[PDB]
Amino acid sequence: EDAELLVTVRGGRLRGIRLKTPGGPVSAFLGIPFAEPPMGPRRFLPPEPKQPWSGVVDATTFQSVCYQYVDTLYPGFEGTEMWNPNRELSEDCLYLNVWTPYPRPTSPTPVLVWIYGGGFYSGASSLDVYDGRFLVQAERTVLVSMNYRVGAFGFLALPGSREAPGNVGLLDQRLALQWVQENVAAFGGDPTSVTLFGESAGAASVGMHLLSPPSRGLFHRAVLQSGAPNGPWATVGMGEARRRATQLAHLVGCPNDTELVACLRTRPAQVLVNHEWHVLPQESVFRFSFVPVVDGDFLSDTPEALINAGDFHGLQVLVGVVKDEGSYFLVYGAPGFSKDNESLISRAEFLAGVRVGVPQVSDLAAEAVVLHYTDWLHPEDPARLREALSDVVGDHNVVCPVAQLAGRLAAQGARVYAYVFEHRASTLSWPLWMGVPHGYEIEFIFGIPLDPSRNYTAEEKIFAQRLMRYWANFARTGDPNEPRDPQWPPYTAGAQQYVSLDLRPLEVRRGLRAQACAFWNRFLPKLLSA
Amino acid sequence: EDAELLVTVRGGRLRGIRLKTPGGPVSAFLGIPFAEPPMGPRRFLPPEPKQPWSGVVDATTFQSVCYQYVDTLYPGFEGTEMWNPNRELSEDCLYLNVWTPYPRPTSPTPVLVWIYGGGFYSGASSLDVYDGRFLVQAERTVLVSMNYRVGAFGFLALPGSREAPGNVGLLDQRLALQWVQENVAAFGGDPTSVTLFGESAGAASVGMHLLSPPSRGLFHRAVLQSGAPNGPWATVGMGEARRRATQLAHLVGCPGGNDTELVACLRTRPAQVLVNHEWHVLPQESVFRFSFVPVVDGDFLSDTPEALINAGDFHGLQVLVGVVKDEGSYFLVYGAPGFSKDNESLISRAEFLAGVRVGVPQVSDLAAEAVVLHYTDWLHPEDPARLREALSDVVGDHNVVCPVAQLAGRLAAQGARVYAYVFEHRASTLSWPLWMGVPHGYEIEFIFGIPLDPSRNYTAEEKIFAQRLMRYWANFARTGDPNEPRDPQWPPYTAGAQQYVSLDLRPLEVRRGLRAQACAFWNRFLPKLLSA
DSSP states (O other): OOGGGEEEETTEEEEOEEEOOTTOOEEEEEEEEOBOOOOGGGTTSOOOBOOOOSSEEEOBSOOOEESOOOOOSSTTOHHHHTTSOSSOEESOOOEEEEEEESSOOSSOEEEEEEEOOSTTTOOOTTOGGGOTHHHHHHHOOEEEEEOOOOHHHHHOOOTTOSSOOSOHHHHHHHHHHHHHHHHGGGGTEEEEEEEEEEETHHHHHHHHHHTOHHHHTTOSEEEEESOOTTSSSSOEEHHHHHHHHHHHHHHTTOOOHHHHHHHHHTSOHHHHHTTGGGGSSSOOSSOOSSOOEESSSSSSSOHHHHHHHOOOTTOEEEEEEETBSSHHHHTTTOTTOOTTSOOOOOHHHHHHHHHHHSTTOOHHHHHHHHHHHOOTTSTTOHHHHHHHHHHHHHIIIIIHHHHHHHHHHHHTTOEEEEEEEOOOOTTOOSOGGGOSBTTTTHHHHTTGGGOTTSOOOHHHHHHHHHHHHHHHHHHHHSOOOOSOOOOOOOBOTTTOEEEEESSSOOEEEEOSSHHHHHIIIIIHHHHHHO | OOGGGEEEETTEEEEOEEEOOTTOOEEEEEEEEOBOOOOGGGTTSOOOBOOOOSSEEEOBSOOOEESOOOOOSSTTOHHHHTTSOSSOEESOOOEEEEEEESSOOSSOEEEEEEEOOSTTTOOOTTOGGGOTHHHHHHHOOEEEEEOOOOHHHHHOOOTTOSSSOSOHHHHHHHHHHHHHHHHGGGGTEEEEEEEEEEETHHHHHHHHHHTSHHHHTTOSEEEEESOOTTSTTTOBOHHHHHHHHHHHHHHTTOOOOOHHHHHHHHHTSOHHHHHHHGGGGSSSOOSSOOSSOOBOSSSSSSSOHHHHHHHOOOTTOEEEEEEESBSSHHHHTTTOTTOOSSSOOOOOHHHHHHHHHHHSTTOOHHHHHHHHHHHOOTTSTTOHHHHHHHHHHHHHIIIIIHHHHHHHHHHHHTTOEEEEEEEOOOOTTOOSOGGGOSBTTTTHHHHTTGGGOTTSOOOHHHHHHHHHHHHHHHHHHHHSOOOOSOOOOOOOBOTTTOEEEEESSSOOEEEEOSSHHHHHIIIIIHHHHHTO
16 A cells, blocks of 8 residues: 555545656545535535545545536537546536645645636536646646536526525635645645636636635635636626526426525436526627626625725736637637638628627627727628637637736736737647637646647647746746746736747737727726716 | 900909919909908898999909908918918908910810818918919919808808808809809800819818709819818807807897897997907817808708718719828817927827817717727827827818718719829928928918929929829819829729829829728717717
8 A cells, every 4th residue: 555645634534546647656636525515405505514534535536527518519529529528427526636746745835726617617627638747747736626516506696595695616616725725735735825727717716716805815826817707708797697597497497586496406407507508698609607696795896896996916916818719719609600611701790790799788889899890991801800700709708808807906016927828739620710719728738748648749848848837937936937048027007018928939028909908998888888 | 455364254344464474374363253242231141143344344463351360379470371361351252263374275174163271260262372373374274263251251150040041151152153154164164164172171162062952063073172071070050050150149249039130230240350259159179160160951951961972872973082191280289288389299198188178079078088099009008209199190080081081982882983192292391390290281282383483492393293283183174084194093982992092202102091990980980979
């Protein structure tokens, strides 16, 4: 028996497994229960801490994936399948995973906590693309990831009710973070040096923990990749949340909040999933049914209000986007789009696509969008229209919410570093017109190209090693920079400097789409108020 | 008694004068009466045709300038003085001028009819810069200019009333155009080939004759320089005109309306008294806004110039339209905070923001925010030089470039043959500061061939340039196409390709889009925003 893979946490004893990497072994503890299973009467309720167990919990394999919609747009396609559940679905899914150097670090080591994205309706910590082994070996940090409830299970809210208070997926994340505070030293991690990082809804989650004081005491630094808590998709108001919960109930044959939730609780999980999409107020891309609700509890105000009121001295943040944030989402509902052709759309499809990509705004707002994203010298050029609709979707949903976060945080005392990730993976299976799509930096941050069984180039491996080093540096010191030789300067509201990440050395640039983002962040809200 | 200087028109006999030009002799008939003097009881009334006279009228010199405000912003400064009245002010000012080749043409010759600008509040056909002698000599056309009433005398309107119906200044123009139809042939001109041209308010006037059926039969082709009838300043609505007239009346002690009594009281006021109060009736401090301008009342204009343009069929119409390179700059020294001809006018962000409200007067705060959004460079939001340029563009785009672009675009899409230019030469003799670039009004002197005047000190290159432009304008008047037999060709402007040419010392260069991005904002979006 190997003593290095036996660990005692507050709940009791665990047995881990030794994992191989090209750089040597790593210790992993996978499928550690951190909450009582949120099933039956516990569905929709805040997570309860896992009760202590006797004997040895087997932590050598990933646990179940939280019940969720499975994408079927392109059956068998790697582009989509890599994001689908790779373990059986279950409501008993509240487990977390710890990776640590082998042998276990005898002294306190910086801790990275990963929060996966997936629109708050999907995701899992067990996806290949999130394999923590390479980061931990190369950069000698402790790495933790958790599962959290998604979809109706994590975010159905009847606000004001005790039966479905909403935001429980976020509380799942908070519980995992408290778990880390209490137990991570037992794996050689330093609880006073926790960096949170996440992508998409993951990044939005990180941002929400930053703005929620009970969470804020649980970690030190933050990395938000291609996402922000101030997106137009990441939060919903109490009224709309109630409307969606009620309509879901109706669709699954349920009729008083108490009675409504009790009926929902009798329904097989798969039945809620089957109707989740149908509660959205319109056809759209980049909108999801059950998301964090602003109800004055977890978030005492909108993330944007909180961001402007905050003193952020003492916080360091790393934020960034990929070169083509919008392209991926277009094939999920914009007319004329497909991964299987050039998606060269007409003006009419462009005009219709705007209503789909910027849902639930007035006709006047839509016209303003059309005004800004139309090149009036070439108003009908199919290729330019394709790019422009991708920009609309990406700017509105990711880039401009990230720029605002970065600008406001910097202006209020945080030290911010910003990047644009510009390398298109040689292994990318999505078409060339999509460019560097959303989500495709993650495999580089996790050092996936170091896996020999995959088909990445020699240059891509070196690049991955550079990225792991920036991220780990940031986790350790609050500054991604290596000792002098081209330096990554902090992002400020004035100079607006960021760097491009790809195979060539850092290049410093100015403005995260400053012109477009003035439109979304400064003007459009005024227009919507009137 | 020289026979070439004697002409009989319908009203009676005329004696003219022989002008010397650095090319040869030209015949000029200056100061021909075309209406009864609109004085006394005739103030504010539509012009009456001049009654026939016995004997010979000496048309040997420019007649009086129509009563008008005289600019005093920079006293003694050439750049402003050149636009000021150079004859005495009078309400008796309804005269026109004809220049014809010497000797008089023997076959019907194309006629160019000039309508001066001056914001509908000033201007005169007698200005040195409008001297028609060089055009006539160089291009062998007949040239005609008229005076029309300006300010209150031409545009004060109490809509519905017969004592001050409004638009009388435009009716002065129409009457002169009718005079051309009736009499131009006696000077050797072809009344079937009349080309109207004008600049600024003159260009807006031209556009309005295009959109008013009674005027439309009096000419054949049109040239609009740096102005359009659809500009936010060229017309006012019926209520706003009434408010302004009523306020002026109040300011000069005129009791607040039986309209007959009120106008009769106004008629007793010395001309200068009305002029002294003209500017103080405007709703707010601004640039590029004029108290008394054409009114949309159903009569002269049956609808707004915007609607008339969208609704019209313009097949068979040839138009030439253009702007100078820096339309806004000149106007900024007239009220925009931080601007002067005497310093760099390197304004702060705060001055920029305040200047936007001055330059885009009487729109909602939201509309103003939209303007700031589009004209701010968000990587350099506070750079003084960029801010100065940006405000100039705001004013120039909103008042001139975008209204011209809309006009050109719609006219083309609806059957007109349209040619568009951007004038890019800054005169060697320009007295305005370098930062103003090529300002509004400064192409005119080249179109009229002023550089060929010996007493002036233009470079030889500018004289060659002037000759090129005169040739383009005359070619257009003769054939509806500014082009010469092939060599660099000026292609037509169309809504899609949006092609225009740069005019300056180098050969024609073809370009696309009259500030297409800006103008989409002003022409397509802003109107929708204002309806909400």
